[PDB]
UniProtKB/Swiss-Prot annotation, chain A:
PANTHER family xref list: ATP SYNTHASE DELTA CHAIN
Designated name of the protein: ATP synthase subunit 5, mitochondrial
Known partners and oligomeric status: F-type ATPases have 2 components, CF(1) - the catalytic core - and CF(0) - the membrane proton channel. CF(1) has five subunits: alpha(3), beta(3), gamma(1), delta(1), epsilon(1). CF(0) has three main subunits: a, b and c.
GO terms (BP aspect): proton motive force-driven ATP synthesis; proton motive force-driven mitochondrial ATP synthesis
Organism lineage string: Eukaryota, Fungi, Dikarya, Ascomycota, Saccharomycotina
Function per UniProt: Mitochondrial membrane ATP synthase (F(1)F(0) ATP synthase or Complex V) produces ATP from ADP in the presence of a proton gradient across the membrane which is generated by electron transport complexes of the respiratory chain. F-type ATPases consist of two structural domains, F(1) - containing the extramembraneous catalytic core and F(0) - containing the membrane proton channel, linked together by a central stalk and a peripheral stalk. During catalysis, ATP synthesis in the catalytic domain of F(1) is coupled via a rotary mechanism of the central stalk subunits to proton translocation.
Additional remarks: Present with 32400 molecules/cell in log phase SD medium.
InterPro entries registered for this protein in UniProt: ATP_synth_OSCP/delta_N_sf, ATPase_OSCP/d_CS, ATPase_OSCP/dsu
Organism the protein comes from: Saccharomyces cerevisiae (strain ATCC 204508 / S288c) (Baker's yeast)
Subcellular location per the Swiss-Prot or TrEMBL entry: Mitochondrion; Mitochondrion inner membrane
A GO MF term: proton-transporting ATP synthase activity, rotational mechanism
Listed GO CC annotations: mitochondrial inner membrane; mitochondrion; proton-transporting ATP synthase complex
Any matching Pfam family: OSCP
UniProtKB/Swiss-Prot annotation, chain B:
Record gene name: ATP1
Site (Required for activity): 370
Keyword Mitochondrion: yes
Lineage of the species this protein comes from: Eukaryota, Fungi, Dikarya, Ascomycota, Saccharomycotina
Sequence positions bearing Phosphoserine: 20, 141
Any further remark recorded for this protein: Present with 41500 molecules/cell in log phase SD medium.
Record's function text: Mitochondrial membrane ATP synthase (F(1)F(0) ATP synthase or Complex V) produces ATP from ADP in the presence of a proton gradient across the membrane which is generated by electron transport complexes of the respiratory chain. F-type ATPases consist of two structural domains, F(1) - containing the extramembraneous catalytic core, and F(0) - containing the membrane proton channel, linked together by a central stalk and a peripheral stalk. During catalysis, ATP synthesis in the catalytic domain of F(1) is coupled via a rotary mechanism of the central stalk subunits to proton translocation.
GO MF term (any one): proton-transporting ATP synthase activity, rotational mechanism
Protein name listed in UniProt: ATP synthase subunit alpha, mitochondrial
Database matches in SUPFAM superfamilies: C-terminal domain of alpha and beta subunits of F1 ATP synthase (SSF47917), N-terminal domain of alpha and beta subunits of F1 ATP synthase (SSF50615), P-loop containing nucleoside triphosphate hydrolases (SSF52540)
Swiss-Prot record, chain C:
Keyword terms, alphabetized: ATP synthesis, ATP-binding, CF(1), Hydrogen ion transport, Ion transport, Membrane, Mitochondrion, Mitochondrion inner membrane, Nucleotide-binding, Phosphoprotein, Transit peptide, Translocase, Transport
Binding site for ATP: 152-159
GO biological process: proton motive force-driven ATP synthesis; proton motive force-driven mitochondrial ATP synthesis
Name by which UniProt lists this protein: ATP synthase subunit beta, mitochondrial
InterPro entries, alphabetized: AAA+_ATPase, ATP-synt_VA_C, ATP_synth_F1_bsu, ATPase_a/bsu_AS, ATPase_alpha/beta_chains, ATPase_F1/V1/A1_a/bsu_N, ATPase_F1/V1/A1_a/bsu_N_sf, ATPase_F1/V1/A1_a/bsu_nucl-bd
Residues modified as Phosphothreonine: 74, 199
Length: 187, 507, 470, 469
């Protein structure tokens, strides 16, 4: 079956798009065209960011689609069928949802991996780079699989660190150790 | 957001590819949810409601749910045969059965396959599963008797051609046997002639085991009556949709007789099993269920079924389908939804009580709750005359008998009632497989009602009855001939009968 | 103008969903017609569900509906025909001439959804109908423009009681009547048609002082629901527009409740108590409120109610019990006692009985009756074990009187010259009060108990005493 | 087959597979997931589409890792049948748990099977005697019959059945099947031990009873298909061997119960009480696969653990349809101390016809029924007021009935230990005689306790002398 089975909430639509356009081989193209229309949707503020949510007709929904495909003369044709589907199912709220999901599948085709290095505060770039190197060096990142690593600020955790990527994490935090210390001195 | 029937990834992926249903799916469709003997197919965009769909596995399934998604075809098949992703091809016919006269002497399953293997049925037509009941104007008032040859039934709740009377009472307390007796007494006219006095008999057995059915056919063949009987069967094993479909197609078979202007009688054993079947069906078509889990429109189904039997107008001959519904009462609880519903629909109740069977009253009829609303409109005139105060005696007996056990003082007047009452009850009792002619029920009832049995001791009442009949057969066989021929007791007959009773009550 | 085209989307029993043309939804309670091989199926719009997809209830069978089948829109509430030539016709739910004396000669048509009268219009009368039936006259007098209620169980000759009422009051009264049968059996139907053809209340050339709406239980539950509505509009036409008196009869209103209950599930409404529709109260209310005596007409409904297993506690009977003006309970026991009327005197109670409305004498006489019977019931427990032993002489006279009264109430019905074969007896109200007064005074306590049984007035009781004497 | 899938979900023991192939197992096919626990057998029950079947799991699902390899075994699992299944205890899957090593067989037959047709039937009428007096009087067994025992443990469900095995199956020469669904393990071990002791199994010697045992510890799904497995073994005997068969099923409430458990998980709106909407159909299939065909006569015995003795619960109700004799045994009568504890006004047989057991027998039985019903009727009056405040006629009736009740107590032979009274076996011809006498009150003149816990009429007399001493 096609790489990465997500099957989200209306992510079966994304899956469908992925596999259908994967056999067209125009997934990068599709993704790019989808991104371009998604961006111009995001930069369309009245409607589709203020009537992102529906209340429109079938016919009016269709006419909203016609304006959307009026803006782009490069819009593939599988995502023009996807637009049709979304119009017909009268979902537009799962427009960005599908975009994100198709993106995950797409970047799975690309083989880009994602990670996160939550910390209390944002840290040094030297640390970021050393960790990125380390993670790529480690078997955790496979070869032919790229690494995207995002440091995030998670002041919710005070002190400590957690490295996260490929749903496998190493958590060397202060909080857990403090917890354990406390617990053991409540023994 | 929400689940949608087009979520299915194969449908969905075709839509992305700009591929469409292409209208082949106006008459074909691809299975995609199946299991539990219920399928839902995508396609069939033209499809009559209630149509029969020939599954490409080869099964037939009626279609009862039509959704803009997936039309829900209730399979008549078996799961193991069926496979998912199959194509289904529309029969193009709303459910229909072969109907004729050749069904006489045939056990047939729901789809009309002779399961007794008497080979091809000579069916003079096909009919449709639901056929609307004839109009108010298309009825004629009922007046023609139907008799089971059981004195209690005939006397207390007389049945007429084109009536619905509900046999209700505790499960498998030989419930069936009460009905079978009717078939047996219908031997006398059937063997004879007079078409309007012949009731062809259609016994419908739903939910019953093959062994039960086999016993029934054995008894019917033993009493040689299978010839005028039709047995429509849907055994317990056979599909719940087929069980649901079975009464309505039994009705159609009956309607051919009725329509032809001939009179017939349909026994529906057991409608309770129809309800269970419709329950299964409904809950796997996932409509929200009615109280007691039986579907919310169970009444509509049952009501339409029962109202399709009656006596037609003189315009339409006056062929009468007569019905006897039979409802099993679980723990004798009539407050139960299915019993409540049926009670309203039917034109009589023939309440049976289990305790009275053990008490020795067999047939055990709970005569207080047994009613025939139409009543003695169709009752034989002679039998009407004699049994006029039979109700009063029994009703008085019921009250008096209750008091007597609560240790209240008893006078001669109460003991007159007690003596009379005891004899009447004993008079009513009859052994299974013994229907008795009206000509020989009228004397016995005369004797009882005219109080001569009060004298005769309770133990030997059965002896008296047997001997009395023999005596009348020997001597007052002229009297019997007259009762048969004129069906009314003239003054001469009443006097003759009184004298006859006295002579045999004098031993 | 241009019928909104609808395409069926889902046939899910009676519920049939249609997909009307965009930017135009036929309003809730409208009537859609779909031409079908069997007439025109009428679908009553009952919800809007979104994007011009409605959910409607069928009023005729749903066989052979092809998905996406063109649906014309009539554009408004199911409109029957009304007129004075609707009298003596059998008219089905969607207003078809099932009279079978050919097409009804329409004057006007009216919708079957109409808002009940306002508080201001309603004017409360206080006049007494009398049926000549002893139990009714003494213990629960009926009142002009009333809402009489025949609560009782299964087959207590419910129809038979109504037939007796039709025999007496309807034939007598000059007003119109409307006979409405909701889920009546076709056996009962044929009898009613024949019976009122025979009594000439339906005169086949002559004028008819009754109209018929025979609703058959084989008709879909949805259609069964709006049999009632149809009947109401005919009555409204009489009450208002013809400005005459009416004398509505509906049978059986448990079927009306039941019908709504069935389609409740299909409408997707969460089951309420004992599986009844959650809209039970308001639906009952619309029916009951529609029937009233306005500044204009006056309508006397007699509504049969089937009380499952005589559980009046059952919420559907209990709700109806409140809404009806002049309750009468007919219990099984009384039938079994052989007393026909089956009216249970203790449980039949009408607030029309007053010492002003029927005067002090009538009231006092009835008060004595009520006490006598209630005592008798109380004494039943003592009599059961102890017998007539601990009882006083006074108690013994009361017991004897109660038995005499019990069987004095017994009176044969004219329509039970077939179901009992005894000539019917109707005794005028004043005469009944007098005759009962005598009994209570004990002026006829020398008369045998069975010489009160199943006979009319005092003259008759005395005559049956003479008969027994001989 | 190289048709494989992965485990998408493990929602209870109703695992869901995702067949990644475009070839899909058919419904009622069987799949094996190979585990370090051995194998797990699953059986396809739904296709949910998108190439995801939903499968009943015959064994426990502890430890399953999602995505694990599924491999398709294909079709209903086929158990192994033969004479080499005689005297073997086989697991649900079929593995011999009596450890006589792998059962070699000729024919392996699919667990699911279709029930014999209406054409293929044979109507029995032959009385089969039990030697239990109450049974003989009220509702005698019949060869090929389907007899049923209602009432839960609280009658000692097993104890009644054990007596039947002891009596009937020592005189039965044909094959015999005990299939015990949800049978409490120690009791099953006892049965196996007893059978070997009574030589009906001999593990060096011959056997002529075969065993299928499903313990109540077994996961619900396993319990659901224990019955179907047993029915296959039975079909081989009934059909292929042709030899007459006995069959015992204990407990078929557990069969229903197992179904009721799976139903919710399967995705069904549960019908009344909680039973599966497919309760009737499921009951239908099982009970029409035990019929007496022209190929063979199989006497079947069904044991229903009536939940709290509510017969109104739908599962006991649906059992009544498929039985030709019933012997409902009541907790009340158990409290009265009567073993056998069979309720006498709640027993029935189609074989109680007067042309079957003879008019004299029927008349005798009739009088008992009437007498006992009177006795039950006057229970109210008796409790509220004394028996000396009953009618003269009635006090005799009551006294007779009190004797009849005690008379029905027959010492049990298999519960000879438990009762502590040496068992009895009383001939049917003898039974008719004994009751005839009692009804004529011939020997009624001696203690009611003399009628208590004894065999034949002669025994009552002797024990009266014993009591007199």
């Amino acid at each position: 079956p096609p790489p990465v089975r997500l099957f989200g909430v209306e992510g079966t639509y994304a899956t469908a798009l992925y596999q259908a356009a994967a056999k067209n081989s125009s997934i990068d193209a599709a993704f790019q065209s989808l991104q371009k229309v998604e961006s111009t949707v995001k930069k369309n503020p009245k409607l589709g960011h203020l009537l992102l949510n529906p209340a429109l007709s079938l016919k009016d929904r269709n006419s909203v689609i016609d304006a959307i495909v009026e803006t782009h003369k490069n819009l593939d044709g599988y995502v023009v069928n996807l637009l049709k589907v979304l119009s017909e199912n009268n979902r537009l709220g799962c427009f960005e949802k599908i975009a994100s999901d198709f993106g995950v599948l797409n970047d799975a085709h690309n083989g880009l991996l994602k990670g996160t290095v939550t910390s209390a505060e944002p840290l040094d770039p030297k640390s970021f780079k050393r960790i990125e190197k380390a993670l790529s060096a480690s078997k955790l990142v496979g070869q032919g699989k790229s690494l995207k690593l995002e440091n995030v600020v998670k002041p919710e955790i005070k002190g400590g660190l957690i490295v996260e990527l490929g749903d496998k994490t190493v958590d060397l935090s202060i909080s857990t150790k403090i917890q354990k210390l406390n617990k053991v001195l409540e023994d | 957001t929400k689940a949608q029937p087009t979520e299915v990834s194969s449908i969905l992926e075709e839509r992305i590819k700009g591929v469409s249903d292409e209208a082949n799916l106006n008459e074909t469709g691809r299975v995609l949810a199946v299991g539990d003997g219920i399928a839902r197919v995508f396609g069939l965009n033209n499809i009559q409601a209630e149509e029969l769909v020939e599954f490409s596995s080869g099964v037939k399934g009626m279609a009862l749910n039509l959704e803009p998604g997936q039309v829900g075809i209730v399979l008549f098949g078996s799961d193991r045969l069926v496979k998912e992703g199959e194509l289904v091809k529309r029969t193009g016919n709303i459910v229909d059965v072969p109907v004729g006269p050749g069904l006489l002497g045939r056990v047939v399953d729901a789809l009309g396959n002779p399961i007794d293997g008497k080979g091809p049925i000579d069916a003079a037509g096909r009919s449709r599963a639901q056929v609307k009941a004839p109009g108010i104007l298309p009825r004629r008032s009922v007046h023609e008797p139907v008799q089971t040859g059981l004195k209690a039934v005939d006397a207390l709740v007389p049945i007429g051609r084109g009536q619905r009377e509900l046999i209700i009472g505790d499960r498998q307390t030989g419930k069936t046997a009460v009905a079978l007796d009717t078939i047996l007494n219908q031997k006398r006219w059937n063997n004879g002639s007079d078409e309007s006095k012949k009731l062809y008999c259609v016994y419908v057995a739903v939910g019953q085991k093959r062994s039960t059915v086999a016993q029934l056919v054995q008894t019917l063949e033993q009493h040689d009556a299978m010839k005028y009987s039709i047995i429509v069967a849907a055994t317990a094993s056979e599909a719940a949709p087929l069980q649901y479909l079975a009464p309505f197609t039994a009705a159609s078979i009956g309607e051919w007789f009725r329509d032809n202007g001939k009179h017939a009688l349909i026994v529906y054993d057991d409608l309770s099993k129809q309800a269970v079947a419709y329950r299964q069906l409904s809950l796997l078509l996932r409509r929200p269920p009615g109280r007691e889990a039986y579907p919310g429109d169970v009444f509509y189904l049952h009501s339409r079924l029962l109202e399709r039997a009656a006596k037609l107008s003189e315009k339409e001959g006056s062929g009468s389908l007569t019905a006897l519904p039979v409802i099993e009462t679980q723990g004798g609880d009539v407050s139960a939804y299915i019993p409540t519903n049926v009670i309203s629909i039917t034109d009589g109740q023939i309440f049976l009580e289990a305790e009275l069977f053990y008490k020795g009253i067999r047939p055990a009829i709970n005569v207080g709750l047994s009613v025939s609303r139409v009543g003695s409109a169709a009752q034989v005139k002679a039998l009407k005359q004699v049994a006029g105060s039979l109700k009063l005696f029994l009703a008085q007996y019921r009250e008096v008998a209750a008091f007597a056990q609560f240790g209240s003082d008893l006078d001669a007047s109460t003991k007159q009632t007690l003596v009379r009452g005891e004899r009447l009850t004993q008079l009513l009792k009859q052994n299974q497989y013994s229907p008795l002619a009206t000509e020989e029920q009228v004397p016995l009832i005369y004797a009882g009602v005219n109080g001569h049995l009060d004298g005769i001791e309770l133990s030997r009442i059965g002896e008296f009855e047997s001997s009395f009949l023999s005596y009348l057969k020997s001597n007052h066989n002229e009297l019997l001939t007259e009762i048969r021929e004129k069906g009314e007791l003239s003054k001469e007959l009443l006097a003759s009968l009184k004298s006859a009773t006295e002579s045999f009550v004098a031993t | 103008s241009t019928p909104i085209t609808g395409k069926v989307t889902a046939v899910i029993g009676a519920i049939v969903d249609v997909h009307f043309e965009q930017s135009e939804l036929p309003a809730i309670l409208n009537a859609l017609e779909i031409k079908t091989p069997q007439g025109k199926l009428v679908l009553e719009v009952a919800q809007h569900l979104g994007e011009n997809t409605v959910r409607t209830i069928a009023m005729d069978g749903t066989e052979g509906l092809v998905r996406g089948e063109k649906v014309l829109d009539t554009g408004g509430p199911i409109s029957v025909p009304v007129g004075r030539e609707t009298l003596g016709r059998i008219i089905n739910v969607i207003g078809e001439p099932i009279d079978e004396r050919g097409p009804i000669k329409s004057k006007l048509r009216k919708p079957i959804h109409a808002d009940p009268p306002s508080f201001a219009e309603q004017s409360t009368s206080a006049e007494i109908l009398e049926t000549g039936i002893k139990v009714v006259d003494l213990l629960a007098p009926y009142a002009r423009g009333g809402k009489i209620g025949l609560f009782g169980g299964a087959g207590v000759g419910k129809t038979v009681f109504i037939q007796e009422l039709i025999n007496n009051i309807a034939k007598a009264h000059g007003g119109f009547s409307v006979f409405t049968g909701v889920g009546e059996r076709t056996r009962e139907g044929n009898d009613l048609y024949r019976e009122m053809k025979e009594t000439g209340v339906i005169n086949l050339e002559g004028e008819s002082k009754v109209a018929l709406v025979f609703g058959q239980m084989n008709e879909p539950p949805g259609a069964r629901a709006r049999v009632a509505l149809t009947g109401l509009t005919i009555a409204e036409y009489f009450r208002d527009e013809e400005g005459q008196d009416v004398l509505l009869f509906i049978d059986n209103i448990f079927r009306f409740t039941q019908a709504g209950s069935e389609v409740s599930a299909l409408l997707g409404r969460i089951p309420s108590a004992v599986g009844y529709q959650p809209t039970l109260a308001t639906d009952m209310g619309l029916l009951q409120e529609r029937i009233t005596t306005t500044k204009k007409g006056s309508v006397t409904s007699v509504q049969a109610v089937y009380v499952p297993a005589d559980d009046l506690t059952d919420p559907a009977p209990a709700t109806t019990f409140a809404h009806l003006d002049a309750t009468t309970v007919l219990s099984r026991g009384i039938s079994e006692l052989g007393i026909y009327p089956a009216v249970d005197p203790l449980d039949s109670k009408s607030r029309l009985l007053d010492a002003a409305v029927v005067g002090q004498e009538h009231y006092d006489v009835a008060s004595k009756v009520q006490e006598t019977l209630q005592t008798y019931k109380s004494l039943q427990d003592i009599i059961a074990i102890l017998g007539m032993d601990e009882l006083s002489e006074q108690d013994k006279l009361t017991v004897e009187r109660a038995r005499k009264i019990q069987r004095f109430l017994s009176q044969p019905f004219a329509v039970a010259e077939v179901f009992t074969g005894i000539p019917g007896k109707l005794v005028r109200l004043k005469d009944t009060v007098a005759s009962f007064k005598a009994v209570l005074e004990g002026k006829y306590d020398n008369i045998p108990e069975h010489a009160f049984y199943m006979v009319g007035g005092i003259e008759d009781v005395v005559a049956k005493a003479e008969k027994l004497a001989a």
